[PDB]
């Protein structure tokens, strides 16, 4: 939710009146990147001015500055307020607070307030080392801590204990829950690498999760990705997919993989969004056979608000939809890896709720799957999946998650899941 009115704003308001030091005035600000999008305090410097006054805090957002409304500016006009601000100059601040953080705004796992990782990797060292391990404790700490959070406590674990967090909740637990535990505490590149690396393991590769990884993960995500991957495996994730692929599929998830898709344009292209629907009729249900070069480069390389709008306007050319051209014009690994992604440039939240269906509809569980997503998604977008699930499902996904799985397993997955609907 953003706002750039303040009489729509239904926070706090708070008035503060700072003087710039020598050290600046003693906080970091973050957001106001994406057009819509607020601008909230990250870090507050302990020994600046902005924590001395202690009228602060992480989470506000910042109405206006020295008279002036900054709702809805870029992050780069209003740094260069407070930077034109001499040293023992006054700036005065109207903050409001009740809005989470931007960044994990659809997120349902939350930065917890009074962290400590000192007190909560104690209380982990003392569960793995209690008779017969305590795990709701380890599950309690672990799932209500932000990624970032989980990893100052692992970096205090290894400054307590001299060993590795991971390595201990390695020996201290196992089957589903190990794996959801140990998934939560590597970064989202790390665990996407990892994902990404265990889906090509041995001869035969695991389709499935490449393309889900592949097709889902933003430009900013496979950027880091690509880094770590060749950090932790000695090799580039490129090179490995070039391995482990062959034919127009291997085309399609090496074009994804480089997160080189075009940035969200300023303006809308009409001409454009007219032509590629027009390539992408001529290419495929128009003719026999099919141009799918042609579609891999559209696909790939429009921005995902230009694609769909083509694939609206691909509607007035083509009696089927791009989800229905795939099914007639392709098959075998292309036409799923096709179809994963047209679902995640319409609706991803959407995409992420049928395959957590699909994972828990029939007999069994395909555990994998549900964790995977339930990890890599907490921070992201788990609110808007949670929604498009009830919506399109009619019972929550807590429901089917408490249907599918027992034990600790399924409360660290009820968790991450963050309460019913
Ligand atoms: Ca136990
Ligand atoms: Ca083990
Ligand atoms: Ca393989
Ligand atoms: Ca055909
Ligand atoms: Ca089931």
Not at 323 to 332: A, D, F, N, W, Y
Request: aromatic share 8%.
């Amino acid at each position: 939710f953003f706002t750039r009115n303040p009489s729509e704003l239904k926070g706090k308001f708070i008035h503060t009146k700072l003087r710039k030091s020598s050290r600046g005035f003693g906080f970091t600000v973050v957001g106001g990147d994406e057009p819509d999008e607020f601008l909230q305090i990250k870090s507050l410097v302990l020994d600046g001015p902005a924590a001395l006054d202690g009228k602060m805090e992480t989470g506000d957002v910042i109405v206006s500055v020295n008279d002036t409304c900054v709702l809805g500016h870029t992050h780069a006009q209003v740094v260069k307020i407070f930077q034109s601000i001499p040293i023992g100059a006054s700036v005065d601040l109207e903050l409001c607070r009740g809005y989470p953080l931007g960044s994990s705004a659809y997120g349902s796992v939350k930065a917890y307030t009074n962290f400590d990782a000192e007190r909560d990797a104690l209380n982990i060292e003392t569960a793995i080392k209690t008779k017969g391990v305590d795990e709701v404790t380890i599950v309690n700490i672990l799932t209500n801590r932000s990624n970032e959070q989980r990893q100052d406590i692992a970096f205090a674990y290894q400054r307590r204990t001299k060993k590795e967090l991971a390595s201990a909740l390695k020996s201290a637990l196992s089957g589903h829950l190990e794996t959801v535990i140990l998934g939560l505490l590597k970064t989202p590149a790390q665990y996407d690498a990892s994902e990404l690396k265990a889906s090509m393991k041995g001869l035969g590769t695991d389709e499935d999760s490449l393309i889900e990884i592949i097709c889902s993960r933003t430009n900013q995500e496979l950027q880091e990705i690509n880094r770590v991957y060749k950090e932790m495996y000695k090799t580039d994730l490129e090179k490995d997919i070039i391995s482990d692929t062959s034919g127009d599929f291997r085309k399609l998830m090496v074009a994804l993989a480089k997160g080189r898709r075009a940035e969200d344009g300023s303006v809308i292209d009409y001409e454009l969004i007219d032509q590629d629907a027009r390539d992408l009729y001529d290419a495929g249900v128009k003719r026999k056979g099919t141009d799918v070069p042609k579609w891999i480069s559209i696909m790939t390389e429009r921005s995902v608000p230009h694609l769909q709008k083509v694939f609206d306007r691909y509607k007035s050319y083509s009696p089927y939809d791009m989800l229905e051209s795939i099914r007639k014009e392709v098959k075998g690994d292309l036409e799923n890896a096709f179809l994963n992604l047209v679902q995640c440039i319409q609706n991803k939240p959407l995409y992420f709720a049928d395959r957590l269906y699909d994972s828990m509809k029939g007999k069994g569980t395909r555990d994998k799957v549900l964790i995977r997503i339930m990890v890599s998604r907490s921070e992201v977008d788990m609110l808007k999946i949670r929604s498009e699930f009830k919506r399109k499902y009619g019972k929550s996904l807590y429901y089917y998650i408490q249907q599918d799985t027992k034990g600790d397993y399924q409360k660290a997955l009820l968790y991450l899941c963050g309460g019913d609907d």
